[PDB]
Symmetry: none
């Protein structure tokens, strides 16, 4: 997710009747022509087209090649100038919305702590920190939500929440 949206690009103003394979061939050819590939082979793994709203997403094999492809904004395909942008959920600062959850009762397991977090929406990452010697929870965890706009809702809802004997600390892990 955090690097997932870091490997896709929005493409607007696509030619009528274009196929996903044709778009893929075009962008791979352009990457090779521009000397923008960081390895042999094909930087674009997949494309998904919405015919009716005339846009597509490209999926790249690497974060650096995705960034390189931003240079193609305005490129001509079948006589039309393509609009190239980041996905709206692109994170320019990776990990900016990772949360630290502290003050967890030390008997709670992964699933139980997740059940607390997922009241606000699905998670893309979670881990509960445990003492590797004993397997015992150290009483803190980290997570990231699928929808990064839920992060501040979750902090507002959970930070300072009394959880039996303990008071939660929920903040950006930073």
């Amino acid at each position: 997710g955090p690097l997932g949206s870091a490997r896709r690009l929005y493409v607007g103003n696509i030619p009528f009747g274009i196929t996903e394979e044709a778009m893929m061939d075009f962008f791979n050819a352009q990457m090779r022509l521009g000397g923008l590939t960081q390895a042999p082979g094909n930087p674009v793994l997949a494309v998904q087209i919405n015919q009716d709203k005339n846009f597509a997403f490209l999926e790249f094999r690497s974060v650096d090649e995705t960034t390189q492809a931003m240079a193609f904004d305005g490129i001509i395909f079948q006589g039309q100038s393509l609009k190239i942008r980041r996905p709206h959920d692109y994170q320019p600062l990776p990990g900016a919305h990772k949360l630290f959850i502290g003050g967890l009762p030390n008997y709670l397991n992964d699933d139980q702590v997740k059940e607390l977090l997922t009241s606000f929406g699905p998670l893309k990452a979670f881990n509960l920190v445990k003492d590797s010697a004993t397997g015992l929870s150290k009483g803190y965890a980290f997570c990231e939500y699928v929808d990064i706009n839920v992060t501040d809702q979750a902090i507002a809802g959970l930070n300072g929440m009394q959880l039996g004997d303990k008071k939660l600390l929920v903040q950006r892990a930073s």
Copy 2:
């Protein structure tokens, strides 16, 4: 054992998405720029990242360069202040950070003296010197902290400080 883990360091708070090669290149460059390298060639042989828990272990070519690199604690790498620590099973040789505590009131018992010391962190060794025949205190003690980093904090917090009519002396016992 006593001589284990002498050429590795824990690095926490690493940049989200960072590669092992990028971390390696960064530390090797810093060793060079910072004047901590002690011979031609790369001091860092390898970096092993745990992506789920956001830490790395650096593997060094030498014992002395590992020690040197501890000075990088807190260095900012791609926006993140790195946490640099010894491996948990690394231990200095016994008595390396033994402390002498002088100027104690002689009516205070072992546990009462220990209380002042344990406020800084747990002890792995302690003894209050007493007259064997009578069992009464000679007003000085020795100790060693579990965490060797605590040693300088105890010295800073207690050395030269007023305790009753006496000024405390807290110093490394050799």
